[PDB]
């Protein structure tokens, strides 16, 4: 009884995968971007990166790798998606239609297992004879590599070493070769493998196991002539080819640690790395001539190319080119130039793309229309935290850089500013105090202060609010809280009969050395005349985990308590009253009288407020293990929360249930796979304001998707599910991947079929598909006040009128 | 002489072993 | 003190049947399995439970049982959740005429109650289903950087504890800052915290060694947990009732951290011990379960020192539990209800020297 509508706003735009090489064409060198759902395919030229193709796949995209198996004018591509489908896809263009046909497809879920901690890998052989997988502990997953595997039926194989960190194919060996690094009780080690496809056995390697640094993280498989691996742990870089044995300790690289390279020359003379903190290495290998002709290692060296972006996967694309995708920051194209600026950096920057994950708080606001509404969300983290503004026209973006952390923001609409908390990171002093690490935009306010107090070499939290303009967002006020304090909630309103307009924030005391925090303050500030000052302060045994308005009074919650205050003439906050939960509140919502509870496992709670009585009286709760990031309420009823493996889910709660047993438990009557880790969820619109959808519900996601969500009526989600239905048979999926599989609810335990929830994109993608497709679909139906056979004309007004809503 | 069979305390009179039981009883 | 002794109830009479094979049924699955009539403690999976079977029908079941699956169930009183018991250890002397059996079982699996039939000959049987056992994936699985999934393995752990769990959380829970909480939110709901902090709590009642005494597995260790803890009925079936390790390890923690008066039941007000003062001398824990001489089954929990207590008859080494040592019954100052006993030791050079036996029964936790 849900009959709920999903769909897309703001496609993804985070960078998880990034590859080059010629697939569109043996003459054209082509750049694939994979952003969770989505592939990107473009064309590299001298000006940059052209644009040619885009497509969506039914899935997460885990892996994605090219190969050229003999025989192929151009190379395939080969995806694997978190659910376990597989596929190899080639591109094919006829004339000026481009499509992508399946070479092939298959599903390599195993009926029992354990993910592995590190997560899937997937590697190809450099001859392209087998696909190597390894997806669960313990064991090893090979796909033959032939032109009659269509069906891609693949074959274990025992793995003694539980723990594996590492594991990468060998360039130049007879046989495929395998070489991987592990760990056990002893240490961390490297061993290599021989794989037998006629046995399907492992066999003893060239060179035996060789005890490494406790802390070897990457391999990287040297090509020709040199061969051999190239092992990087945080200390020290080296390359063991059996007999030969070569490493180097820098001092450079001792700061960060190396998440990612990319390899540069054809010959593997050079190689890039990046760091956590953006830095970006040259790794060198010089070249030895022997004296018979052959040749061999030399020496290894690094140099600091500079710093950049938070890269997530590097790749060098020509003519000292680099794409650097960022998960966190946004994805740029940087020069490598010969010369140093005065500065020392070699990287000058040339583009850049829009990324506005993770979201990790957005509001909605009307600043000039007055009728059309706009969001402002808290992207990045790190030196890439900022502030964007959305607003429809494609969606038009701005961005304000912070440099920063931003955690949470609110709106005040009298005082025409924003309110920000935000954390900057601190490097202590030996000599005492703190020493910052760049000028963030929480020190270069115009006017500042610090909380009065009250009761090395490591890095300190420091937080602060931040008061910006609303015109031109510039920092106007900042305010620093005390040592060893974390601020969590944000919120403006007013209280009581008081006229004014104040900011609250709920801060925890915390120390590493216990772990519950046990301390906590609740702080009233006032803005006004270009000064902030704390009109009232409050002491709290807890942590104030969530905060919000209610009907002139304060909610908030402490620890395991759901405590209400009033706001008295004296500008004091009096406690209420009091309710005792066996879980920790931290998502609290309200909506007219009714409360709205939940904790980190999936444990609902709904509340009701008695002013006869002034105290609260539980109604409805549902228990359920499972791991929860958001909660909203659509209404006096339903309830829509986002849990584990990227699941939607819709409750609701039987009003007329005839005993008391039946009324006091909620019913799960929706259940949706989205795809994406929701993060927040507000109420508001894009569109300028009877209608077929009531409600309107904005989510944001990590990956940066923005998604709305809306109600419906049973006859409308009847014909809308009879429409997919209908659809599923005619729609070309990319590598033939079921609908109601990948939309299917997916945990490691259970598995539901999809219901409640209606795909708002694949009803949007009736309008792509020619003409005649179109009368097929509709063929032998019905449609509205005496049912008719309907016509195609009709279902693309209902599909133009549902679009028309975001 | 006389015992509980439960708490096995020691007693003397019937009266005391009677009222004993009922402590630990339904 | 060798704590060791305690477990193996060495007062039954050694020389005990033993048996090696094990039989797990399927969860979800539906079972028919008869129930002991005398039994009435709330077990939990992995405690040991020893019994003696009296009247002669129930020898017969026991009897019968033996060459069968060895299994039975128990139910946690209305019956609506129990547990199953697998019988591995078994003796019979038939002394004194009467049939004396004398039977050690451990619990298995938990179930809820689907039918309850009663037979002619007396004895009850029980359709019941087989409730899973669920272990949630890592917190930060959802939310992750692949190319940080590198950096989850950590070296082999060893001031310097304390150095190694921050530098634990700050790496582990790095992907918290995708989210909207910080790393130490995350960090509560951790089986591996959450277990070194219990670890740390039982220090206190014990000079054991982390290794060996307790188990790695988040589920045996949160049962092994909660079959030592002087809570009441409806505390331990409500744990019971948990389905997850984590909530079962969370309320262990705050059960642990909060309850630290045990009162009188009966009274409910005259206080009788502190949680300061609680100690272990079985390997155990600091409660474990004994049988008397007629086959009652007692929960047993050792304490220092103990208070509002009148002590009747005389120090006896007849049957005790613990070797080397006599009792005399104790009883409530106020209201006169057995509360437990005393033991005194005969021989000098024993640590300690005397203590109190408090029966679980007569417990009440409460919360100053
Ligand atoms: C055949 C026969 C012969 C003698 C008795 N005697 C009695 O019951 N005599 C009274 C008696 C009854 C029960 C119990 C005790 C004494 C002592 N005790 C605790 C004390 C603490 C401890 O560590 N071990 C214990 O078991 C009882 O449970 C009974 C029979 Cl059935
Ligand atoms: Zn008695
Ligand atoms: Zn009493």
Redesign the pocket.
């Known amino acids: 009884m849900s009959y709920n509508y999903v769909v897309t706003a703001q496609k993804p735009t985070a960078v998880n995968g990034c590859v080059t090489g010629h697939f569109t064409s043996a003459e054209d060198l082509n750049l694939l971007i994979a952003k969770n759902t989505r592939l990107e395919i473009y064309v590299v030229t001298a000006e940059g990166l052209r644009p040619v193709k885009e497509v969506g796949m039914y899935g997460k995209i885990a892996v994605m790798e090219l190969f050229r198996p003999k025989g192929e004018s151009k190379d395939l591509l080969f995806i694997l998606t978190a659910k376990y489908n597989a596929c190899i896809l080639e591109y094919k263009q006829s004339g000026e239609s481009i499509d992508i046909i399946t070479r092939a497809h298959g599903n390599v879920q195993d009926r029992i297992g354990r993910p592995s901690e590190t997560g899937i890998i997937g590697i190809i052989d450099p001859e392209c004879r087998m696909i190597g997988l390894r997806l669960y502990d313990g064991l090893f997953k090979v796909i033959p590599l032939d032109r009659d595997n269509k069906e891609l039926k693949a074959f274990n194989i025992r793995l003694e070493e539980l723990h594996v960190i590492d594991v990468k194919f060998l360039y130049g060996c007879q046989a495929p070769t395998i070489c991987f690094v592990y760990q056990d009780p002893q240490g961390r080690h490297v061993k290599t493998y021989e794989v037998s496809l006629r046995e399907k056995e492992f066999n003893k390697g060239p060179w035996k196991q060789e005890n490494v640094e406790a802390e070897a993280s990457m391999v990287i498989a040297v090509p020709e002539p040199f061969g051999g691996a190239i092992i990087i742990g945080q200390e020290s870089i080296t390359y063991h080819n059996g007999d030969k044995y070569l490493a180097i300790a820098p001092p450079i690289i001792k700061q960060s640690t190396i998440v990612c390279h990319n390899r540069v020359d054809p010959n593997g003379s050079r190689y890039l790395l990046g760091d956590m903190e953006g830095r970006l290495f040259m790794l060198l290998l010089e070249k030895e001539e022997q004296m018979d002709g052959t040749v061999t290692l030399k020496d290894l060296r690094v140099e600091l190319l500079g710093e950049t972006s938070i890269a997530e996967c590097l790749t060098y694309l020509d003519n000292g080119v680099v794409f650097v995708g960022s998960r966190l920051g946004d994805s740029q194209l940087v020069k490598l130039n010969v010369d140093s600026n005065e500065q020392g950096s070699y990287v000058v920057a040339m583009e850049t793309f829009t990324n506005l994950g993770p979201i990790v708080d957005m509001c909605v606001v009307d600043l000039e229309r007055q009728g059309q509404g706009q969001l402002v969300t808290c992207s990045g983290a790190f030196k890439e935290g900022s502030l964007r503004i959305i607003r429809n026209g494609k969606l038009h973006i701005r961005t304000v850089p912070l440099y920063e952390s931003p955690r949470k923001i609110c709106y005040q609409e009298v005082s025409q500013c924003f309110g920000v908390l935000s954390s900057r990171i601190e490097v202590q002093d030996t000599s005492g105090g703190t020493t910052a690490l760049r000028p963030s935009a929480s020190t270069q306010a115009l006017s500042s202060s610090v909380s009065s107090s009250k009761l090395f070499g490591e890095e300190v939290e420091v937080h602060n609010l931040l008061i910006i303009d609303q015109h031109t967002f510039e920092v106007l006020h900042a305010h620093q809280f005390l040592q060893n304090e974390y601020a969590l909630s944000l919120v403006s309103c007013k209280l009581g009969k008081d006229p004014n307009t104040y900011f609250i924030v709920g801060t925890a005391m915390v120390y590493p050395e216990e772990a519950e925090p046990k301390q906590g303050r609740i702080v009233v500030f006032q803005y006004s005349d270009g000064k902030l000052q704390t009109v009232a302060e409050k002491e709290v045994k807890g942590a104030v985990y969530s905060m919000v308005e209610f009907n002139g009074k304060l909610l908030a919650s402490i620890n395991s308590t759901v405590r209400l205050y009033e706001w008295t003439t004296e500008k004091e906050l009096r406690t209420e009253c009091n309710h005792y939960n066996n879980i920790m509140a931290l998502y609290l919502k309200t909506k007219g009288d009714f409360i709205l509870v939940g904790d980190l496992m999936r444990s609902v709670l709904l509340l009701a407020y008695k002013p006869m009585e002034g105290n609260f009286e539980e109604i409805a709760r549902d228990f359920n293990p499972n791991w929860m990031s958001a909660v909203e309420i659509l209404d006096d009823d339903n309830f829509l929360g986002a849990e584990n493996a990227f699941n939607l889910f819709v409750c609701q709660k039987d009003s007329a249930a005839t005993t008391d047993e039946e009324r006091q438990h909620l019913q799960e009557v929706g259940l949706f796979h989205l795809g994406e880790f929701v993060n927040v969820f507000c109420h508001g619109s894009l569109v300028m304001q009877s209608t077929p959808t009531q409600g309107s519900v904005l989510f944001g996601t990590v990956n940066g998707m923005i998604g709305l969500v809306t109600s419906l009526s049973e006859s409308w989600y009847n014909l809308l599910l009879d429409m997919q239905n209908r659809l599923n048979k005619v729609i070309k999926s990319v590598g033939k991947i079921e609908h109601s599989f990948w939309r299917s609810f997916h945990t490691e335990r259970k598995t539901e079929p999809a219901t409640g929830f209606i795909d708002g994109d694949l009803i949007e993608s009736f309008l792509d598909i020619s003409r005649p497709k179109m009368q097929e679909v509709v063929a032998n139906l019905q449609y509205d006040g005496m049912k008719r056979e309907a016509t195609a004309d009709d279902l693309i007004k209902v599909v133009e009128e549902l679009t028309r809503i975001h | 002489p006389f ?3 439960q ?2 305390a020691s007693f003397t009179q019937k009266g005391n072993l009677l009222r004993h039981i009922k402590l630990h009883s339904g | 003190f060798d704590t060791s002794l305690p477990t193996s109830h060495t007062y039954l009479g050694a020389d005990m049947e033993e048996f090696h094979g094990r039989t797990l049924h399927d969860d979800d699955s539906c079972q028919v399995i008869p129930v002991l009539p005398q039994v009435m403690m709330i077990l939990i999976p992995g405690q040991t439970l020893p019994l003696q079977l009296f009247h002669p029908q129930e020898v017969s079941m026991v009897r019968n049982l033996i060459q069968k699956d060895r299994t039975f169930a128990v139910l946690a009183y209305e019956a609506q959740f129990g547990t199953t018991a697998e019988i591995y250890a078994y003796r019979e002397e038939q002394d ?1 005429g009467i049939e004396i059996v004398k039977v050690k079982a451990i619990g298995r699996q938990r179930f809820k109650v689907l039918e309850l039939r009663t037979q002619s000959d007396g004895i009850q049987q029980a359709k019941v289903q087989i409730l899973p056992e669920c272990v949630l994936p890592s917190t930060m699985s959802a939310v992750q950087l692949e190319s940080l999934n590198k950096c989850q393995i950590f070296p082999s752990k060893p001031q310097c504890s304390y150095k190694w769990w921050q530098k634990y959380q700050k790496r582990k829970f790095h992907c918290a800052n995708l989210t909207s909480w910080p790393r130490w939110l995350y960090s509560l709901y951790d089986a591996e915290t959450l277990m070194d902090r219990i670890k740390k709590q039982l220090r206190e009642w014990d000079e054991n060694l982390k290794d060996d005494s307790l188990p790695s597995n988040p589920i045996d260790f949160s049962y092994r947990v909660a079959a030592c803890l002087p809570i009441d009925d409806v505390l331990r079936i409500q744990l019971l009732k948990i389905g997850s390790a984590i909530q079962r390890l969370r309320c262990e923690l705050d059960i642990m951290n909060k309850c630290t008066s045990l009162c009188c039941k009966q009274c409910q007000e005259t206080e009788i011990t502190t949680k300061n003062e609680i100690f272990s001398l079985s390997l155990c824990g600091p409660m474990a379960a ?1 049988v ?3 086959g ?1 089954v ?1 929960e047993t929990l050792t304490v220092y020192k103990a208070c509002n207590l009148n002590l009747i008859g005389r120090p ?1 080494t ?5 070797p080397g ?1 006599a ?1 005399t019954v104790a009883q409530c100052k106020i209201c006169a209800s057995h509360i437990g ?1 005393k033991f005194t030791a005969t021989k000098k050079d024993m640590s300690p020297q005397k203590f109190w ?1 408090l029966t679980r029964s007569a417990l009440l936790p409460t919360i100053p």
Not at chain 3, 318 to 322: G, L, N, R, T, V
């Open positions: 015992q509980c069979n708490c096995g | 004194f004994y008397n001489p007629h009652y007692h006896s007849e049957h005790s539990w613990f040592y009792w006993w036996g």
